[PDB]
RNA sequence: AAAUAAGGGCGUAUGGGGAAUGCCUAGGCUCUCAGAGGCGAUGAAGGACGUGAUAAGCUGCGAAAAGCUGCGGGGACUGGCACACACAGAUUGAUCCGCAGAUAUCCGAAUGGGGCAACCCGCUAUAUUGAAGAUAUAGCACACCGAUAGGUGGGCAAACCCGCUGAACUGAAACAUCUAAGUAGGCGGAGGAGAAGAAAACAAAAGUGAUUCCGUAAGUAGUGGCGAGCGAACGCGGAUUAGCCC
RNA sequence: CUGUCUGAAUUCGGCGGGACCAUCCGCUAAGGCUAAAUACUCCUGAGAGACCGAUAGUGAACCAGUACCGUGAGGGAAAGGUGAAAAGAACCGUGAAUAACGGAGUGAAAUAGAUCCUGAAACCAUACGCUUACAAGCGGUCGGAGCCCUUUCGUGGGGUGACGGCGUGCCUUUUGCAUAAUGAGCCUACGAGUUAACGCUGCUGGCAAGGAUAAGUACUUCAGUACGGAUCCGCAGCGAAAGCG
RNA sequence: AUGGAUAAUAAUCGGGCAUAAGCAUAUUACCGAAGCUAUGGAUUUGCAAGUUUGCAAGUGGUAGGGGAGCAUUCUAACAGGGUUGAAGGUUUUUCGUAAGGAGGGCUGGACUGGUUAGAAAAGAAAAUGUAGGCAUAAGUAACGAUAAUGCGGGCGAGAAACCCGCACACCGAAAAACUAAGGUUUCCACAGCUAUGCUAAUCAGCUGUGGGUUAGUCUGGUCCUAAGGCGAACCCGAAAGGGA
RNA sequence: CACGAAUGGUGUAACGAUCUGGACACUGUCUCAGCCAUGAGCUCGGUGAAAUUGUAGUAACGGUGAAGAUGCCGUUUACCCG
RNA sequence: AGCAUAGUGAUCCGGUGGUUCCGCAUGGAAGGGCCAUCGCUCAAAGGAUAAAAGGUACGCCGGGGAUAACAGGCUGAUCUCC
RNA sequence: UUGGGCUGUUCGCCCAUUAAAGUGGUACGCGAGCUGGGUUCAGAACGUCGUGAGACAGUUCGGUCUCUAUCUACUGCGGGCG
């Protein structure tokens, strides 16, 4: 017998197009141009996970950085000496105590100094 | 319809009794004088087609 | 210019018409042919003539 | 009234546009069972022109023109698609269906001559002013045979079948023998089928007894630039069965 | 069988048994007719489909071999749906207007009003919320304030997003393409390894030194149990063959 | 380290710039990948328990090979749903490794579909693919001989183009009259501005209604014949047919 | 290098929208361009296409690169729209 | 068979010698089969046929930057300069 | 950083001047800027090769150069905002 797969043909491009929701142009209403963004935009979206995980470490350093600064260290020497200490406290916490907890982040710089 | 057989390779590619082809050998048809008995007598017994053509012989002998 | 069809209404009976095509042996099966196609419109003498 | 970034971007809502999708059928496709396989000089197939209370098309019908008659069925509506303003017919039994009849213009084998199909022009008999211009009816082609009054055939149209002719592309990884293929195509005739059909036949030491078709035999014997390829027969099992005339 | 030439005997004769000869076997040419089983569908009556459903199915579901194209042979389309029933919008107003619209009546529906069932996408516009006139590139992704709606009240949801990091579309062909190598204006619909016959491998099933029927036939509630062993494969191979096993 | 010429659009340690932030050796800390590890989860083979669990080794991938499945249309059985709202369209929530499943609101107003088994016209993003619809170029090219127009009245809702009048201009061996070929009603009058007229139109070779073609002498037939055609009889050729 | 006698040899009055060289007259052909008129063009009112088109918020230099970059790297420049 | 490695040509077809091997009803025969052996500069020597040369600027179709002419790129043989 | 004669010419030789008459690159710059004189289209003829069809880095006469500027790049002129 004659098989059409009318319905679903449009109901499967709806769900894919239904994502590309904000886009500039023809790009959100265009079925072969948002196919093509939609793939490419989760493409994109599988990298910058990996990379997310090593963008913030460097914000973490950057902060444990310029905290340790301010008592005439560096972050080098004062990591150094943190790690030959027995701490194991890692840059997230690190950070957010020098950010938010100058007072904690100070008794620890002179604990492991 | 149904597999006609080679007629060149019926004539040819006598089967034996359980999975292999009998054929002849060449070279002994007109210049016998000038080669060696040795040659002509190895060149007489039948022989068996080789594994990498057995797959074509039986092919065309329409036995797949 | 000058184009390739220049009308006349018996050059063209004399070439195309129903005693033209009725003549011949195969002309008379152009007139089979077009009965079994349905052919409103057989040879050219189908058209009505001035009244 | 309000707002205002001249304008642009994104999101929501409401519109126009278009015809997809969903549902449906008026139409198509492949077949099974049982029939039939033709029409035409008493003028075919196919058309032209006409025909309505009203009528542009389609349908039906031919100057007897959406109709006439006979025999059966049928019992209240009917004057086709087609309605509306109307006008008429019809339980005395209409309309309608089945079968059998009548009329059936012109062209068309077209057949009185011709011709540019649906046109023109005639001869002989009769009648009309009969006489010029013209009219109404009948008969006027060809081939054969019938000895003579008259009979037969012209042409059209699906497939099957028969006879006469009859390619090339393609394959051979080129190409000429070969294949494609006695296929496509062309021409003529007949019937529901046609052809074949009753042994100057097979077979082999045993035998069968007309032809046709189905399954094996068999991709076997064989044939072939022994290349591509082509490919029986005997015997066996079934359908049907029928033999006769010079 | 013959286009051309030649050319026999009459039954102790003639022909055939795959060159030919002898013996055996079969038949009796140079005359004709013959139903059944067999092939097809311009048709006819009845009936079906794990057949299509309006770009499908016949070219043609509809004034289709039509409209259009050519001198001609010839080629050849597009075009279905209001509503249960037209009850198809009397009447009033704006308007020059029987252009259109707003009312009023019909209906269950008039956003079912004749472009008439539902009616999407491309495409063209209006209103509202957030941003945008010192800022350079496949326009996205990961972070990230601020401002608008909602709220089981939230390390809840939705919209826009100032600013920062990364990032040279897709397909095909290629050693190698962002390539300035090919291709596509977009959307909707159509569109490309399917079937028959004959075989081979993997899985599964029946029977088992045996396995299986074909054509056909009978019955019947009929495109759907019994019978049918003709025949095919296997069980023994070697040799060109006689032959041996 | 220094001198030993350099190329044509503006240049280079990548740039700022550095006398060390250059070079040579030695040391320490740190940064640094999808590598390794920490946590959670999924899957393939091999080994055991059973009827999923545990351990070990793995899990980039083109040509290509293998295994589990989803949707679509229809069919056979059992079990259902729907005018108290089916299919279809539009939004939203949730579930699965994915193809996808289920539920809610709005439009819609009659069909639909679960489980097991079966079949296939069984899935598009590209073929300078086909048909229909709609954009961009863009309110851009163009509006078809540079013979020419101006004013005043008329109908009219509406006049640069229609009608009338006065002026101007063009052709005039023509852009004048007849008519053949051809077209086959376009001819004339009245209503209309929908489509047609490359603009509007009250106008028209457009639309709808009523009319229009009169022959003894004109052109053809009834008269004749040329080129050529047909052609009884006759002569040829497989047939159709050819010559005459 | 490598003409040659009816694929004819050598001349020839007239002729040629034939090819080639030179002379007179004449001129915007030029030195060297300038001025004027109409149509097109430009603005406005009416009607209104097409070729082309993967999406685009579409810079320059030096370099890299399938060896010649709007989209990549570094630097420089650039208010938005016609 | 030669001190050893080169002195060579598949299949089909046809010829010669030997052979109760078969020989289409039977007995012969024609013919075929088996062994030995002959005929191919098939020299393009794994030989597509027994049998085969050119032009296209009148050309056409299907493909290639798998492959040349112009330009770009790499290197200087040649060139130019020191 | 000149103007002419010859040649399609680049090049080159020559004539008259000048302070000088430079060497090169930019797809041997520039044909959606121009011309088509040369070269590679179809016609014809000569020399030569080929039996022939035809050919020549041999010569001569003639022979259609398509496109309405989207983005960027330039030359000018405006609107909005700050």
Redesign the pocket.
Known sequence: ???????????????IM?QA?????????????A???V???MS????????????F??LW?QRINAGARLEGMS???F??KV??NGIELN?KVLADLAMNHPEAFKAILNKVK | ????????A??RF?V???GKI?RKH?????????????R??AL?H?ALVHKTDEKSIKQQL??? | SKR???????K?????????R??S??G???????????????????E???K
């Open positions: 017998p004659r098989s059409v797969n009318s319905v679903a043909k449009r109901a499967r491009r709806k769900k239904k929701k904000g886009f500039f142009g023809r790009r959100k209403n265009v079925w072969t141009v196919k093509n963004a793939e490419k935009a994109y979206a599988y990298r910058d996970r990996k990379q997310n995980k090593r963008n470490r460097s350093i972050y080098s020497q990591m150094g790690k030959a840059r | 319809p149904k597999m006609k057989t080679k007629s060149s019926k004539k006598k034996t009794g359980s009998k060449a070279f002994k048809s007109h210049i016998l004088t000038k080669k060696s008995k040795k002509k007598l007489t039948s329409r036995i797949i | 390739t069809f220049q009308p006349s209404k018996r063209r009976r004399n070439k195309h018409g129903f005693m033209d009725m003549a042996a195969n008379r099966k152009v007139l089979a042919r077009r009965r079994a196609k349905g052919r409103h419109k057989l040879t050219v003498s189908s009505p003539r001035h």
